[PDB]
Amino acid sequence: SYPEYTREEVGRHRSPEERVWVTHGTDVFDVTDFVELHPGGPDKILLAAGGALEPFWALYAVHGEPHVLELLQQYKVGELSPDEAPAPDAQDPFAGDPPRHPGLRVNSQKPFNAEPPAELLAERFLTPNELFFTRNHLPVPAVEPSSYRLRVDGPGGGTLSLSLAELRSRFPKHEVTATLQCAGNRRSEMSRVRPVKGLPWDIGAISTARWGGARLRDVLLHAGFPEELQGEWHVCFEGLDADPGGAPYGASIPYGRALSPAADVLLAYEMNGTELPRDHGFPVRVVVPGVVGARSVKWLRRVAVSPDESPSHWQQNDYKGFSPCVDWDTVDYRTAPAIQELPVQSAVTQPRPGAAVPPGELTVKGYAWSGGGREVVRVDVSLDGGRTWKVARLMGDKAPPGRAWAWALWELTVPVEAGTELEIVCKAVDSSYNVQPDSVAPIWNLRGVLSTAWHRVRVSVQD
Amino acid sequence: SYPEYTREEVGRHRSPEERVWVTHGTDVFDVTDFVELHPGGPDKILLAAGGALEPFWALYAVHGEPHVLELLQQYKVGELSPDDAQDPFAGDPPRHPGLRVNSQKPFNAEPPAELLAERFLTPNELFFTRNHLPVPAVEPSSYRLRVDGPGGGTLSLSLAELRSRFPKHEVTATLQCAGNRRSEMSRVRPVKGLPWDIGAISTARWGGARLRDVLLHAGFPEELQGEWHVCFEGLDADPGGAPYGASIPYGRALSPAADVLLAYEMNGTELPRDHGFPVRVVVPGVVGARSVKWLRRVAVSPDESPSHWQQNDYKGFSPCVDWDTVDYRTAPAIQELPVQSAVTQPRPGAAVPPGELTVKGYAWSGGGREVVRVDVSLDGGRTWKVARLMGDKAPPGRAWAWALWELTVPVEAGTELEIVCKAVDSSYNVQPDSVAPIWNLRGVLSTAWHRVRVSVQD
Numbered sequence: 047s048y049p050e051y052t053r054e055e056v057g058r059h060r061s062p063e064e065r066v067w068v069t070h071g072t073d074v075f076d077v078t079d080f081v082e083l084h085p086g087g088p089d090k091i092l093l094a095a096g097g098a099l100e101p102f103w104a105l106y107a108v109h110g111e112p113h114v115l116e117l118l119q120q121y122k123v124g125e126l127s128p129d130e131a132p133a134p135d136a137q138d139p140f141a142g143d144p145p146r147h148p149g150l151r152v153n154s155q156k157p158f159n160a161e162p163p164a165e166l167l168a169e170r171f172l173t174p175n176e177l178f179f180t181r182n183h184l185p186v187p188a189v190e191p192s193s194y195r196l197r198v199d200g201p202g203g204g205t206l207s208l209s210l211a212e213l214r215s216r217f218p219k220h221e222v223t224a225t226l227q228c229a230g231n232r233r234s235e236m237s238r239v240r241p242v243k244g245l246p247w248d249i250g251a252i253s254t255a256r257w258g259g260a261r262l263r264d265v266l267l268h269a270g271f272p273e274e275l276q277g278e279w280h281v282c283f284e285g286l287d288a289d290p291g292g293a294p295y296g297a298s299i300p301y302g303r304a305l306s307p308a309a310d311v312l313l314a315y316e317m318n319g320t321e322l323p324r325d326h327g328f329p330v331r332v333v334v335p336g337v338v339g340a341r342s343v344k345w346l347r348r349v350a351v352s353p354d355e356s357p358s359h360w361q362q363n364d365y366k367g368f369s370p371c372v373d374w375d376t377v378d379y380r381t382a383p384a385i386q387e388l389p390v391q392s393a394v395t396q397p398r399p400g401a402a403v404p405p406g407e408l409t410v411k412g413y414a415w416s417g418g419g420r421e422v423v424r425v426d427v428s429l430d431g432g433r434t435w436k437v438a439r440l441m442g443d444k445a446p447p448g449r450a451w452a453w454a455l456w457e458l459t460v461p462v463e464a465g466t467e468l469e470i471v472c473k474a475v476d477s478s479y480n481v482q483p484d485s486v487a488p489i490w491n492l493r494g495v496l497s498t499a500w501h502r503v504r505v506s507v508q509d
Numbered sequence: 510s511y512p513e514y515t516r517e518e519v520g521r522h523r524s525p526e527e528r529v530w531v532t533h534g535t536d537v538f539d540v541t542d543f544v545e546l547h548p549g550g551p552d553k554i555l556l557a558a559g560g561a562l563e564p565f566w567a568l569y570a571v572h573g574e575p576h577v578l579e580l581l582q583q584y585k586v587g588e589l590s591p592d593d594a595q596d597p598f599a600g601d602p603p604r605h606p607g608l609r610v611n612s613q614k615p616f617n618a619e620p621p622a623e624l625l626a627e628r629f630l631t632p633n634e635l636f637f638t639r640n641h642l643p644v645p646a647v648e649p650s651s652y653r654l655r656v657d658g659p660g661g662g663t664l665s666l667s668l669a670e671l672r673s674r675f676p677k678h679e680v681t682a683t684l685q686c687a688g689n690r691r692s693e694m695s696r697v698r699p700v701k702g703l704p705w706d707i708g709a710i711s712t713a714r715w716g717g718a719r720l721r722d723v724l725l726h727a728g729f730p731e732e733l734q735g736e737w738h739v740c741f742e743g744l745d746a747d748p749g750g751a752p753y754g755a756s757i758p759y760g761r762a763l764s765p766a767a768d769v770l771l772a773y774e775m776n777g778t779e780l781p782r783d784h785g786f787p788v789r790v791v792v793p794g795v796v797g798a799r800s801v802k803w804l805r806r807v808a809v810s811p812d813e814s815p816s817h818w819q820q821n822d823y824k825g826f827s828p829c830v831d832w833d834t835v836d837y838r839t840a841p842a843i844q845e846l847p848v849q850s851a852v853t854q855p856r857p858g859a860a861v862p863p864g865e866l867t868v869k870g871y872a873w874s875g876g877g878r879e880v881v882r883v884d885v886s887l888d889g890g891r892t893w894k895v896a897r898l899m900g901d902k903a904p905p906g907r908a909w910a911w912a913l914w915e916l917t918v919p920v921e922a923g924t925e926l927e928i929v930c931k932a933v934d935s936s937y938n939v940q941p942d943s944v945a946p947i948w949n950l951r952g953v954l955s956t957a958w959h960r961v962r963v964s965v966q967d
């Protein structure tokens with residue numbers, strides 16, 4: 047008595063005129079008429095249009111209670127049917143890419159690059175897997191579990207070939223909660239100064255998850271490498287994704303970080319308690335805590351030890367910072383170091399730019415984070431464009447010294463006067479007392495990476 | 510043949526009327542008349558007035574040549590003679606008169622800014638000095654270093670034992686006071702603290718025992734569960750008996766890479782009295798406050814040092830905090846310092862000649878993070894050029910020493926410049942544009958861009 051629909055067909059209903067449909071479990075709901083009845087307005091609920099409620103239920107667990115579910119059942123109109131998963135490259139190179147939640151803010155479809163709606167970013171310490179930002183340079187690899195092999199070699203160690211099963215049984219499983227931030231986060235603020243090359247990220251190219259897997263340290267020691275090597279040695283990684291020419295995505299990290307127990311570098315097979323999603327590297331990815339997202343290679347195929355940095359294009363000719371004076375005709379990637387640890391950062395996630403907020407009390411919220419395991423010791427929040435500041439409340443548990451891999455969510459509730467204008471700014475300070483710079487121009491660079499000047503959000507107060 | 514004078518006497522002769530006297534070796538020279546004949550002008554030579562030429566000779570080795578030593582010998586006027594609670598500072602060591610002194614009792618001073626980046630290693634005589642108390646008079650033979658803590662064998666090391674039981678390690682490290690550049694903070698709103706300019710920072714090659722080796726020798730383990738600390742106590746104390754003290758996390762004390770030393774040598778000689786004789790702690794990449802001088806005790810503890818200066822000083826606060834709301838429990842003790850840089854050449858208000866101008870300075874970052882770039886502006890931060898970084902590369906994570914930089918640029922007659930510098934470290938940390946947003950009641954952690962205005966001779 048209930049018509050069946052595919053995830054794809056449900057994704058066609060994302061608007062009132064079209065009808066707003068959402069899914070939960072294997073049920074399909076038409077909540078067009080409910081949007082106006084939703085507590086807190088339609089702004090958040092409409093973020094789920096055409097897709098699953100799952101991730102949003104994880105952010106706001108009150109929806110899991112019986113009374114909310116009983117309300118939701120009033121809007122049921124169908125059921126989902128298993129999605130067939132078909133014959134690569136006939137249609138196109140990205141034809142086998144996994145489906146994604148429609149609530150993501152996509153800035154590139156082929157290759158797929160997207161960030162979750164900024165208002166949801168600092169609503170939960172662990173970012174739901176369906177909303178975790180995604181950055182793909184190439185088509186997503188389609189991997190058959192049983193035949194996948196991770197190759198590990200290099201000078202001083204034999205040559206291993208580990209199946210997913212062996213990775214899971216041979217090495218003790220460790221979990222590390224770590225925030226991944228792309229080098230291009232907040233690149234859109236760089237473009238306001240002068241046009242740059244790169245994906246036009248807003249403040250959401252950063253997400254946090256509890257990663258589970260083998261320690262890189264343990265796998266390399268098993269391969270026979272020593273705990274320490276004299277001089278500057280590197281651990282190079284190569285993914286299963288490659289361009290038409292055959293060069294795979296690759297990156298490396300210093301050998302010292304790879305072998306250090308406290309550095310928590312993992313060969314992760316689990317993400318937020320479940321198997322790694324395809325977009326995030328199924329079956330295995332490197333996770334390098336405190337280091338720019340580019341080095342956390344997904345769809346891992348090879349691990350090697352070398353006296354030199356990875357020769358990959360992305361290690362050598364991308365992801366570097368330059369003086370603001372450098373232009374395409376003078377840029378020389380030999381003159382700057384590959385980005386490994388990232389500088390202190392923060393952004394306001396609530397309210398959003400252009401909002402008109404009710405007078406009285408306003409709760410300002412956001413995230414703050416610093417690379418290299420350096421914790422956030424304070425976040426300063428201004429309502430007047432950075433003239434005067436108040437200290438925000440830092441949420442969450444502290445971590446051991448030098449191992450603050452996860453962001454600090456913060457919030458501050460402040461009184462706001464009817465009919466005024468606000469310019470809301472946040473800036474964070476880390477455990478080495480490094481701070482964020484006032485403006486973007488002086489840190490501008492042609493690729494628009496390393497965008498950490500204060501985040502400024504303009505809103506008005508209603509009357 | 511020659512009258513003999515003490516250093517104190519020679520320090521009274523620093524001008525034409527009193528006569529300008531300087532020393533070299535054990536000789537005293539009256540160079541009053543030679544000041545006008547000194548190549549380059551009187552400015553430089555007069556910096557040494559009343560004191561030793563040694564430190565300056567080290568900055569400019571051209572002075573080591575035969576003709577310079579010979580040119581000086583004709584001005585000899587004499588020879589140097591060696592050597593209660595009403596004045597607790599009566600026992601302090603003599604200092605070079607060329608230092609820029611901000612406090613005499615207790616003694617706190619910095620070298621002239623123009624000399625700071627003139628040599629990678631700062632001569633011992635010019636190395637900035639920060640004393641909270643009177644300097645301890647220590648007899649070498651009877652000096653003992655106490656080491657103790659839970660799970661370790663109590664040690665009582667003499668200087669000789671500190672030199673022989675532990676393999677000597679040498680670490681070149683820059684010490685920077687938390688108040689360096691405080692004067693830029695004062696400009697915005699008055700703060701509490703010594704009025705340092707840009708010279709509360711200096712660099713030396715330190716030599717001593719690794720703290721790690723001493724602790725291991727006592728039986729302490731490489732790692733302790735939870736957050737443990739290593740506390741230091743100096744021999745200097747207030748009138749009530751509380752000694753200067755500080756601490757560093759246990760993890761840093763035991764790390765082989767952290768290079769923390771129990772130093773007994775500074776730039777090749779024994780530690781000067783003002784810099785901790787006979788032994789000081791040197792904590793590379795960490796604020797000067799933690800490098801306890803005149804070390805008397807090393808203790809392992811589950812808690813941070815209870816000292817006043819570890820608990821109720823040397824911390825950073827929001828710019829909104831004032832004396833009526835400051836609460837030292839709300840911030841962490843300063844350990845690693847943030848990226849920093851300053852222009853040492855030209856000096857503020859100078860009138861430089863048209864043509865080419867060489868701008869020079871220093872740059873450094875804490876935590877062993879090397880300086881990867883220094884941007885220099887001549888138009889107040891609108892446009893920037895990249896400076897040349899001098900110095901030798903250090904191993905990743907172990908860049909404890911500053912990077913001296915320079916940039917030569919063409920300057921037009923009759924112009925006005927606003928020279929600005931900013932540095933970037935290897936975790937790509939950067940310095941903030943302005944001082945107001947990082948202001949704090951103690952004026953510490955002053956790392957906004959350094960701005961120097963000068964004019965070009967028309």
Ligand code: HEM
Binds near residue numbers: 084090106108114
């Ligand atoms: C058709 C699906 C949905 C239904 C039936 C629903 C229903 C409800 C109900 C009954 C409450 C009040 C709970 C209580 O405290 O008793 C609530 C609150 C809330 N819901 Fe939903 N919701 C839906 C979808 C969503 C989605 C997708 C989001 C976020 C993307 C969301 C965000 C919120 C928030 C933020 C509140 C908090 C209260 C406030 O707005 O001030 N809801 N919702």
Ligand code: HEM
Binds near residue numbers: 555571576
């Ligand atoms: C009585 C003590 C001194 C004597 C006899 C002396 C003598 C000289 C002589 C002979 C030269 C030229 C060497 C050559 O042939 O290249 C010279 C150069 C120089 N001296 Fe001294 N000097 C004295 C003190 C100082 C001091 C204390 C300073 C530093 C603060 C200083 C800074 C310099 C500099 C910077 C130059 C190079 C000039 C330039 O850049 O054009 N001198 N001095």
Ligand SMILES: Nc1nc2c(c(=O)[nH]1)N[C@H]1C(S)=C(S)[C@@H](COP(=O)(O)O)O[C@H]1N2
Binds near residue numbers: 178184325
């Ligand atoms: N194999 C492979 N790994 C990769 C990439 C890639 O394109 N291929 N993108 C990198 C970059 S630049 C980032 S920011 C992170 C993003 O991870 P995520 O998609 O799971 O958020 O993956 C890194 N790992």
Ligand SMILES: Nc1nc2c(c(=O)[nH]1)N[C@H]1C(S)=C(S)[C@@H](COP(=O)(O)O)O[C@H]1N2
Binds near residue numbers: 638685802
């Ligand atoms: N025992 C003792 N150690 C000390 C101090 C002190 O007053 N007593 N001053 C500290 C501070 S605040 C600094 S900045 C450095 C300065 O070292 P220096 O004088 O050798 O330059 O010493 C540190 N070590």
Ligand SMILES: [Mo]
Binds near residue numbers: 230
């Ligand atoms: Mo990235």
Ligand SMILES: [Mo]
Binds near residue numbers: 639685687688797798
């Ligand atoms: Mo200091």
